Amino acid sequence: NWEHLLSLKRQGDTAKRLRIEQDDTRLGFEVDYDRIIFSAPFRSLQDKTQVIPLSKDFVHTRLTHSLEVSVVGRSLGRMVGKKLLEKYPHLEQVYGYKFNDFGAIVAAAALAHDIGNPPFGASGEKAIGEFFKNGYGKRYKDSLTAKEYQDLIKFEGNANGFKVLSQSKPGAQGGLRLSYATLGAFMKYPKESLPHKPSDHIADKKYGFFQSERALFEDVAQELGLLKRSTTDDVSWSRHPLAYLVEAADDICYTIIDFEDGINLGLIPEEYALEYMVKLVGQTIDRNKYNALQETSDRVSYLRALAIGTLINESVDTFMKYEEEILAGTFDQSLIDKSNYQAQITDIINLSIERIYNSREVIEKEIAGYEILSTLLEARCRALDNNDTHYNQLIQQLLAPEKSLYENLIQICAEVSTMTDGKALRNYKKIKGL
């Protein structure tokens, strides 16, 4: 039920924090927002790849993408919360909740939803995985549990993001110490790395936490009241209802903005821009304003602003139509896939894949990223092995100012993923002496 889903608990708490005992100027979710804003992991997003590597231009990075997702998520959360308190009046009438709380939760979750991504993006994650699969790290296969090896060979940015958010350090336990509602709404694949893709459900495409933090998530999963889907030997719970909204906001934003940026770069003609969006923007377009503009940028910006407004309302309608199934855990798709504009979205995505992801420029950067990440990971792993050599001591002093082998390897992968693109490239040249 909804009372346990909006928990204000933080790690290490003993008492019970109640909504009616909060300070209304600064609620806990706003504190979460402010704690994410002021941290270094959030700042490192400014020079991390969204689509085009090493482009910190007029193209998007992870930071600006996260900000746009935050705005869209705040809007979605406010509408859905107003409709929910309309449906269940006891929430507001007894517990003391307002529709701004839902917006704060979704905004905070959407702000930190990519905070664990490594440099170079998808190619970076695949390179980290291939290093342990077919490279040097393969030699560790026999020393590790099967699920730990699966963690290392299918490295996921979501698990690393959870690790960053809930990291324990000497003298400061809990990390950022976010609320449990925010951690639940941030969590989109509540399962371990094995088994690999059991079903066709949407919460099974990947995994969301490592083996070193499973216990932590267990605590979270038992406070919110999430339904359990497996207890044999591998735990898996159902989604928090607001993770659907977070995912919808992320999908809308990147789907539209990638097209707009590709048009502005010179890779997609504007005829496609009008053709694939006339249906989306037809219900609110004022042709006069469209015909007055004299630049491609103004036209594409107008079209994007209209399309986002249409899609947000459609998503809210879908969520309120399937609320019961979502709360019961039986809803196996995304809110976007149940929309009237699926064909247009698929056409835009296919055009983006053909014209942007496979561009020469984009390709060369990913190959360079593969080389850089492999070099840095091999250096760290060889330093971890010997430990007695002078060279090993130098590498330790440069790249790292009692734990198990799995903990050491996962820490190595986490430290590689903190770097930006430029810092990784600079370290690569310094290692090579170039």
Ligand X SMILES: Nc1ncnc2c1ncn2[C@H]1C[C@H](O)[C@@H](COP(=O)(O)OP(=O)(O)OP(=O)(O)O)O1
Ligand Y SMILES: Nc1nc2c(ncn2[C@H]2C[C@H](O)[C@@H](COP(=O)(O)OP(=O)(O)OP(=O)(O)O)O2)c(=O)[nH]1
Q: Please report, as ranges, the residues that interact with a second copy according to CB under 8 A.
A: 123, 126-127, 130, 134, 358, 360, 363-364, 366-372, 389-391, 394-395, 397-398, 425, 428, 430-434
State which of residues 306, 316, 345, 383 lies at the interface with ligand X (CB under 6 A). Answer: 306
Q: Which does 309 bind (CB under 5 to 8 A by kind): Mg ion, ligand Y, a second copy, none?
A: Mg ion
142 is in an annotated binding site: no
Burial (CB < 10 A; 0-12, 13-18, 19+), residue 331, is buried
Q: How far apart are CA 63 and CA 74, in angstroms?
A: 17
Whose Cβ is closer to ligand X: residue 301's or residue 392's? 301
Q: Which does 88 bind (CB under 5 to 8 A by kind): Mg ion, a second copy, ligand X, none?
A: none
State which of residues 97, 132, 254, 406 lies at the interface with ligand Y (CB under 6 A). Answer: 254
Give the distance, in angstroms, between the CA of residue 369 and the centroid of all CA atoms in the same chain.
21
Whose Cβ is closer to ligand Y: residue 198's or residue 282's? 198
Check: CB of residue 122 under 8 Å from CB of residue 362: no
Copy the structure tokens of residue 217. 């998530």
Whose Cβ is closer to ligand X: residue 70's or residue 117's? 70
Q: Which does 51 bind (CB under 5 to 8 A by kind): a second copy, ligand Y, Mg ion, none?
A: ligand Y
Q: Which does 316 bind (CB under 5 to 8 A by kind): Mg ion, ligand X, ligand Y, none?
A: none
- Interacting residues with ligand Y between 99 and 138 (CB under 6 A): 121-122
Shortest approach of ligand X to residue 298 CB, angstroms?
11
Shortest approach of ligand X to residue 14 CB, angstroms?
39
Is residue 225 involved in binding ligand X (CB under 6 A)?
A: no
272 is in an annotated binding site: no
Q: Which does 358 bind (CB under 5 to 8 A by kind): a second copy, ligand Y, Mg ion, none?
A: a second copy
Is residue 357 involved in binding ligand Y (CB under 6 A)?
A: yes
Copy the structure tokens of residue 387. 């430990």
Is residue 260 involved in binding ligand Y (CB under 6 A)?
A: no
Is residue 308 involved in binding ligand X (CB under 6 A)?
A: yes
Check: CB of residue 369 under 8 Å from CB of residue 119: yes
Q: How far apart are CA 181 and CA 184, in angstroms?
A: 5
Phi, psi of 172 (to 5 degrees): -145, 95
Give SS3 for 236. strand
Q: Which residue stretch of 89-97, 196-204, 307-315, 323-331 sits at the interface with ligand X (rule: CB under 6 A)? A: 307-315
Q: Which does 199 bind (CB under 5 to 8 A by kind): a second copy, Mg ion, ligand Y, none?
A: none
Q: Which does 207 bind (CB under 5 to 8 A by kind): ligand Y, Mg ion, a second copy, none?
A: none
Give SS3 for 237. strand
What string marks each residue from 310 to 329 as x (binds ligand X by CB under 6 A) or -? --x-----------------
Which residues 6+ apart lie within 8 Å of 161 measured at CB? 112, 113, 114, 115, 116, 117, 186
Shortest approach of ligand X to residue 304 CB, angstroms?
6
Q: Which does 114 bind (CB under 5 to 8 A by kind): Mg ion, a second copy, ligand X, none?
A: Mg ion
User: In 3D, which of 205, 191, 200, 188 has the Cα closest to residue 241?
Assistant: 188
322 is in an annotated binding site: no
Which residues 6+ apart lie within 8 Å of 265 measured at CB? 59
Whose Cβ is closer to ligand X: residue 9's or residue 304's? 304
Check: CB of residue 417 under 8 Å from CB of residue 411: no
Q: Which residue stretch of 13-21, 243-251, 303-311, 390-398 sits at the interface with ligand X (rule: CB under 6 A)? A: 303-311
Q: How far apart are CA 310 and CA 283, in angstroms?
A: 9
Whose Cβ is closer to ligand Y: residue 151's or residue 250's? 250
Which residues 6+ apart lie within 8 Å of 93 measured at CB? none
Rg of the chain (C-alpha set): 23
Residue 41: is the preceding peptide bond cis (ω within 30°)? Answer: no
Check: CB of residue 245 under 8 Å from CB of residue 319: yes
Copy the structure tokens of residue 430. 């310094």
Number of other CB atoms surrounding residue 292 within 10 Å: 9
Q: Which does 252 bind (CB under 5 to 8 A by kind): ligand Y, Mg ion, ligand X, none?
A: none
Element (H, E) at 226: none
DSSP 305-339: HHHHHHHHHHHHHHHHHSHHHHHHT---S-TTTTS
Is residue 71 involved in binding ligand X (CB under 6 A)?
A: yes
Under the rule (CB under 6 A), what is the footprint of ligand Y?
A: 50-51, 121-122, 250, 254, 258, 357, 362
**Binding interface with ligand X (CB under 6 A):** 71-72, 75, 304-306, 308-309, 312
Binding-site annotation: residue ranges for dGTP: 50-51, 62, 158, 188, 206, 258, 357, 366
Residue numbering of the annotated binding site for dATP: 26, 34-35, 50, 75, 188-189, 258, 304, 357
